Design a protein around this ligand. Structure first.
Ligand SMILES: N[C@@H](CCCC[NH3+])C(=O)O
Ligand SMILES: N[C@@H](CCCC[NH3+])C(=O)O
Lengths: 349, 341, 341, 349
């Protein structure tokens, strides 16, 4: 069973959020064959396990991707595919790493593998299913950090739907219509963020994105709806961010919040962090700590698992969600090498 | 034929822009019966004609409405329905006023009746159909002035489609918002110290986002005399970088006619005789008056019973008493200017 | 002593906050002469006292003004000057009303007169000096209500200094602007649908830029009952990142007293007897009523002749007739509540 | 006469705008000694000349600096001083370059040197004095481009003073006061620029800077004043930019415009451009074309001299106006070398 050919076959199985079963089965097979006792759980996660040691470590990735396949090709040193980077590659690298684990290490560690479902959706159903069922001492989240990167944190998230409906009236009267009231709210949110962001590094900025806007063709009534989202710095968790957005909203506007995720930023010096620092050096690289603008199951899991936790994976995260998503094979391989080393170093304490 | 019941039956026939034929039919029927030689023209306008005299008077209204039907009912002295005020009401008032003209006036005037199609749309197809097919000495536009009101002017108009196309920092939609916010701030600065007729009005009609990335906005400007379409277009294209593509359509010139005119004097007398106090008005929407001024270089006002603040609202209605006063005023004004000739 | 000429002489003495001594002197003099045992206290307040009765009534006004002297003149029935309305006028009206009290009332009431210092400043030093030195059963605050007007309430207040300090993309000044623009947008959203008394008012008082780079702003908020100082402070500090430093001072609680009270009833009678129609008012500024409510848990209103829209303007004046009606109303109200006791 | 010691002595003579005479005299001396016939003109420019050829080339720098000396020290390979980079170094490099010119080149070229006054002020008096007096075939503007850089353009400029005065009134009334009306104008300008800048590279963006804001302590009247400036892309020259700012200003606001400068962006392939491309290669570097966000006498002179023109100078322009302004000596020297080569290559056609 070869790392890159196993990944390729993973990439070839489409797995938009909610439709992960086929790939879970595949990942579970490969894990069965590698001695990781693979299976597919009640949430359709790809599950595995190796080792019998008392130190519980969870290697948790996600096996869903954003919708829309890209044809898979190995060409040059680059493997192309939806999920190459985000994040079938990272999770497959977890699988092979765990598969090549020392007897010494299978003595100190019990390593649980979770290919989580619906990480790309608001639910994170998969990570949430597993949260009350595992009690790790350490957790590694499979998201692309680059093979030399150790990511220490990810921003939180808030999804907002805003709505205005009112009686229709002539477009020449000075009173704003429903769409305009929504725009004006959004503009107020921009102003709020600009003030909130003064002097702040990107990890500490409130960021917003207008995702959708719809206006009903008006007849008796005007209806407009707006979907936006925020990426949340540590200083502004979701419940605080809701109080702010609510205070900036006039009473004419209906708000619905969802996809609440808390930010997470872990300390620079833990057993886990040293373990990866050492493994990247062994593998011949220069480790760099990273903080990421995105949101991951690290945010989802932090409230449940009060333990040292980082995110690691080969590949370049700026290829998330693009039509030419790919990883360098040599990077993917260094990725496996780093995961194994990190586990071994963990076991050597 | 009863004025109010005839209007009611007009309201009961949906005539959203482009689908005016059924109601034109009904209006033409009614005009036949009244001795107004009713018919439907090629542009599906309701047409009628009375009189033989040398001086041509056009009473031009419109018979399309914006969409959304209001259940038609008579209740508490008010007739409710889409078009009650804008502008089936005013046109029906024109029909009945014409129908009761003295034989004295029918020899001084020839009076043409046009229930125009597509006035609520960018085309104004209706009014543009008859523009070169009639040669008025005077013209009255049927839009709600209030029964004691005579409307001297309507703002011009410009419609705009803005488009932005990108690749998946801020996205196409957000960039269109920045444009919209700048044009708003521009309009506020241009408007400081101006009365409503002299203000620029800038409205977002629609905003469409398509998950490359692409977004469009449609805007609707109403234009004061100091800022006609080609001027407004120069500002807007100047504030748009080449990356935001603008399309212009629906251009109409503002119009504001003089306070003292034979038409104007006729209506003030007609109004006083009907027991009211006449009041000049400038309207902040746009009308077929704007479409027609460039073709008919003649005295022109807009008149009709009803309160224009109900235009396009879901409780559109006219007061019955006021509607009847509309009929009376029209007839007397028509009468007064037969006397001046 | 003539009321208007006495007021005039008061206006003619500058009393910007902190420099009230000369005019307190003059007011104390005048109160001596009137048999009101005039003096100047340690906080430089103008003080006076009349009556012997068990029920203490405080007529408290202020004698400082904002800076900028207006040439004092009597002209067209109007007395012009800094303080004419805010609030030398109301206090002088209180002096003369007290000076003409019946001997019947002088046995029911003891009436204290305070021309407070520094009411225009954050300190309100004056009113805070007397707060624990008097024990009123009722209190009247001398601020322009209009002669037919009785003021039930004034908004609270919060002052803010914002500072930003950097190294020479956007500069410190611009970043302070972003904060200001956000707090404005916050206030507009909080105010939608609220009457003025229930609105938050957010004013830029000063903006200082010093070419590291450093800039400061000073803001002045007026606060509705639903948003007192400590609440307003929680919003503002929440919307400020740590990089923008906020200082709070000048906090005053909003106050809005009940419509039906012996004080309130007294003034409505006094007003009717003076030939006017009494009207409750809520004022959008801040006053010593706000400073004093927390100390004097007793019925309280503000009253004085003059139109408060002239506060702080360069044409500040009171109409002479209205000023005299102020005297009359005050006296009658004082009289009416001696009768209820 | 040594390049770096001559520069050092230039840096030691303070020359804030308007007070350049002392340094002009010094620069003129050195030019006299080097055979460039130095003198100080009616505008206090440092003037020189070398060569008798029919091809007129002007090497024009500026000898004024922003106010505020920094103590001069040669330490490490770095020479510290107000003007090291902007722009006494560049002009001194012009002087020594011209001084070491071939006989072959003094035959084809007449090279005019101008150490212009008041370039850092709105006037640009010095460049404007010289504009009607020289008819170059080529012009090189002495501003720091880096020793490997050839700058092809600089943005234009507009200075704006805005004022509002009105009758004073109570701070609790909803009507905005004078300072607030000015802020609101500025905010409108921000919105205008944000829309103008959609999709635009920095050289093509309208940029603004609030320079000062004053509010009179109000007594009978409110007075507020605001000073800001714009850096102007090629698509928006100063007269167009005035129409825009004026349209966004309500009639209550008084505007005064000044320091109008037109943007300039020259073509990539001219005799001058090839001449510098070749000289940087000879000197062992990789030439890069640059467009700059700042404004220079290149903008001032372009309308007068319809000829190929670039900006060149050793040093890093991000040290303009900072308290530790300096140039690497070795860079300064490469700078001279490049200027000479460029002149020689010009003469060799
Ligand atoms: N009267 C309608 C339509 C104007 C366009 C004329 N074809 C309006 O104000 O929107
Ligand atoms: N009445 C003044 C001052 C209020 C502060 C009381 N010490 C104002 O509205 O600004």
């Amino acid at each position: 069973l070869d790392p890159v050919e196993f990944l390729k076959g993973a990439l070839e199985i489409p797995s938009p959020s909610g439709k992960e079963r086929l790939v879970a089965e595949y990942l579970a097979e490969g894990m069965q064959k590698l001695g990781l006792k693979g299976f597919v759980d009640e949430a359709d996660n790809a599950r595995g396990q190796v080792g019998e040691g008392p130190v519980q470590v969870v290697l948790l990735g996600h096996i869903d991707t954003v919708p829309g396949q890209i044809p898979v090709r190995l060409e040059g040193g680059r493997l192309f595919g939806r999920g190459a980077v985000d994040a079938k590659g990272p999770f497959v690298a977890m699988i092979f790493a765990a598969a090549g684990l020392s007897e010494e290490a299978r003595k100190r560690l019990t390593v649980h593998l979770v290919g989580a479902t619906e990480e790309e959706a608001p639910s994170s159903k998969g990570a949430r299913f597993v949260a009350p069922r595992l009690k790790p001492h350490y957790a590694v989240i499979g998201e692309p950090s680059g093979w030399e990167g150790i990511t220490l944190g990810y921003k939180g998230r808030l999804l907002v739907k805003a709505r205005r409906e009112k009686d229709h009236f002539h477009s020449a009267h000075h009173e704003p219509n429903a769409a305009e009231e929504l725009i004006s709210y959004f503009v107020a949110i921009k102003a709020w963020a600009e003030a909130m962001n003064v002097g702040q590094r990107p990890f500490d900025q409130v960021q917003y994105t207008l995702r959708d806007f719809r206006v009903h063709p008006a007849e008796l009534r005007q209806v407009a709806e707006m979907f936006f989202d925020l990426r949340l710095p540590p200083r502004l968790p979701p419940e605080e961010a809701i109080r702010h957005l609510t205070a900036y909203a006039p009473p004419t506007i209906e708000l619905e919040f969802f996809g609440r995720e808390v930010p997470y930023q872990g300390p620079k010096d833990t057993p886990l962090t040293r373990a990866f620092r050492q493994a990247i050096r062994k593998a011949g690289g220069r480790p760099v700590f990273k903080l990421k603008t995105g949101t991951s199951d690290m945010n989802v899991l932090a409230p449940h698992w009060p333990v040292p936790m980082v995110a690691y994976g080969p590949g370049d995260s700026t290829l998330d969600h693009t039509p030419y998503e790919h990883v360098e094979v040599a990077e993917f391989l260094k990725g496996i090498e780093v995961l194994r080393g990190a586990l071994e170093a963990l076991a050597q304490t």
